[PDB]
Design an enzyme around this catalytic site. Structure first.
Site, PDB file in Angstrom:
ATOM      1  N   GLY A   1      35.956  41.356  44.046  1.00  0.00           N
ATOM      2  CA  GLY A   1      36.667  41.842  43.375  1.00  0.00           C
ATOM      3  C   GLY A   1      38.123  41.052  43.126  1.00  0.00           C
ATOM      4  O   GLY A   1      39.713  40.956  42.699  1.00  0.00           O
TER       5      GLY A   1
ATOM      6  N   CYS B   1      37.734  37.427  41.720  1.00  0.00           N
ATOM      7  CA  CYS B   1      36.979  36.409  40.551  1.00  0.00           C
ATOM      8  C   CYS B   1      38.008  36.208  40.422  1.00  0.00           C
ATOM      9  O   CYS B   1      39.347  36.029  39.160  1.00  0.00           O
ATOM     10  CB  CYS B   1      35.773  37.171  39.636  1.00  0.00           C
ATOM     11  SG  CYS B   1      34.426  37.541  39.888  1.00  0.00           S
TER      12      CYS B   1
ATOM     13  N   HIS C   1      33.148  35.438  32.658  1.00  0.00           N
ATOM     14  CA  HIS C   1      32.143  35.837  32.688  1.00  0.00           C
ATOM     15  C   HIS C   1      33.182  37.127  32.631  1.00  0.00           C
ATOM     16  O   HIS C   1      32.761  38.316  32.793  1.00  0.00           O
ATOM     17  CB  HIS C   1      31.295  35.929  33.739  1.00  0.00           C
ATOM     18  CG  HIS C   1      31.922  35.865  35.505  1.00  0.00           C
ATOM     19  ND1 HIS C   1      32.574  35.502  35.901  1.00  0.00           N
ATOM     20  CD2 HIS C   1      32.497  37.760  35.344  1.00  0.00           C
ATOM     21  CE1 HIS C   1      33.134  36.158  37.430  1.00  0.00           C
ATOM     22  NE2 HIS C   1      33.161  37.604  36.384  1.00  0.00           N
TER      23      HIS C   1
END
Lengths: 298, 298
Positions: free
Chosen positions: A141, A143, A39
């Protein structure tokens, strides 16, 4: 009882940042390969419903900024492994430990090394819930942050963070890029299943309480696997299988309390409450310690 | 809310084992120096009331076995620094980070890297209690394990474990060899003081709860520092100073809740209970998060 996490040292050296456009997140650097959530190529507006193959075709090797602290690498082979971005780099990581990718079952535990933009900041121990989520509270924040286990020298990587679901729980994948649960990597209508309590773990935590000093919750009642799973179904617990009985064997032998008698002790704690009494300094039934976590600390 | 510990990587490289006779415990290897509890020279029977100077005079440099995993070192200078054994070795540690020895105040927190015979096994976050103990539950057979903080690259060493007190709590020293509290390194009548709750930390944890989602414990009552410390004295809490008010300032500004209004929210939680409602998934008031720990995670 203290919730213990594995030493994060062997994993810290594998932490890098992947920066694609305006999106920056953490990455796993093993040999001449860098793993991060796919992503990273999505551009927020594209997160509603992304076409990952289409989005990757318009991305080149110079669109990815892999950075190992001070050292910037270079991508020679971008690829996609299910929901993971497999980035082939030029230099092999000199800090690469002995590693294996495992897929952990629900109810099992791991240590999470939370990083923010490639630099590790904190470490904690959590569990994979029956509904396949984790209650990591703040992986915000972060990931790319990984979940792992350690056996002497060998690091068992099992989790990478992708998503903070609309209900504050966290969703993610294994290191083969396959999600834990029915979840996809897409900002959409993603409902988590009704979470049950990990029964095996509650029994393990009670076995731990006996070894330390707490004994008051033990009674002279007994209960077979049939009557207990009837009560477990009522209090939104996991049913207990014969395999879970076999796992608790070594902990039963150490304390002299048969697993079915421990189940009878739990059965009572669900129906009669706790009346403001603390098992291991806690007023609630802790379900995030496996029987293997109890043995390794005793 | 998850209790987070610092990445243990920079400390793992400094872990060695010191073996003196039948006694084996963990050691801190920094530069050409190895620190470990001085009770390593005691021989169990000698632990009732030891004469440390007398015991050290009959110990030579070849009575200490410093081992860094596979590598065995050699002692060239044994010394005693208060309650610590300062061992000068031949080779400087190539894994030595930037380090400083600090003495942490009661109420403050640190990460503990628990080791067993020189090899690190687990990491957790704890707090220095007002009575100067730590509730580390299992530091059993881990003497020498260190407590630390990390600021970017700099490791702030602040604790080394020495003693598991007869009441299951843990006693130890700073890295200058000076004990936290009135305790000595001697198996004797050692009574810990009546532990109070760290008020500042409870207020910080409630401020954290506001940032996450919990807000129900907030009311429109206010209370000054006088009336609150009167109630704090009643429920075995620490009195709150004007300095603690100043520390909570940045967290007050972020949530829009004045510290005295937060104190009024706490005042109510002590007198009216909680009625089976969970603040951050916990039925009790958690006191082991500093306001600096809340800010670093938000």
């Amino acid at each position: 009882f203290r919730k213990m996490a594995f030493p994060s040292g062997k994993v810290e050296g594998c932490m890098v940042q992947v920066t694609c456009g305006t999106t920056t997140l953490n990455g796993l650097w093993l040999d001449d390969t860098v793993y991060c959530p796919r992503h990273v190529i999505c551009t927020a507006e594209d997160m509603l419903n992304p076409n990952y193959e289409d989005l990757l075709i318009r991305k080149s090797n110079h669109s990815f900024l892999v950075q190992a602290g001070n050292v910037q690498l270079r991508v020679i082979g971008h690829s996609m492994q299910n929901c993971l971005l497999r980035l082939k780099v030029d230099t092999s990581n000199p800090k690469t430990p002995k590693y294996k990718f495992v897929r952990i079952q629900p109810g099992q535990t791991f240590s999470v090394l939370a990083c923010y933009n490639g630099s590790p900041s904190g470490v904690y121990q959590c569990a994979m819930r029956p509904n396949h989520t984790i209650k990591g509270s703040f992986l915000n924040g972060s990931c790319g942050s990984v979940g792992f286990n350690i056996d002497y020298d060998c690091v068992s990587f099992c989790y990478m963070h992708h998503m903070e679901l609309p209900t504050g729980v966290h969703a993610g994948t294994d290191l083969e890029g396959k999600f834990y649960g029915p979840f996809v990597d897409r900002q959409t209508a993603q409902a988590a299943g009704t979470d049950t309590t990990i029964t095996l773990n509650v029994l393990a935590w009670l076995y731990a309480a006996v070894i330390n000093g707490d004994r008051w919750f033990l009674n002279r009642f007994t209960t077979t696997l049939n009557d207990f799973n009837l009560v477990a179904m009522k209090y939104n617990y996991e049913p207990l299988t014969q395999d879970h009985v076999d796992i608790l064997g070594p902990l039963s032998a150490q304390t002299g309390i048969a697993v079915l008698d421990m189940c009878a002790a739990l059965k009572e704690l669900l129906q009669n409450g706790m009346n403001g009494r603390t098992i291991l300094g806690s007023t609630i039934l802790e379900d995030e310690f496996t029987p293997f976590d109890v043995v390794r600390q005793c």
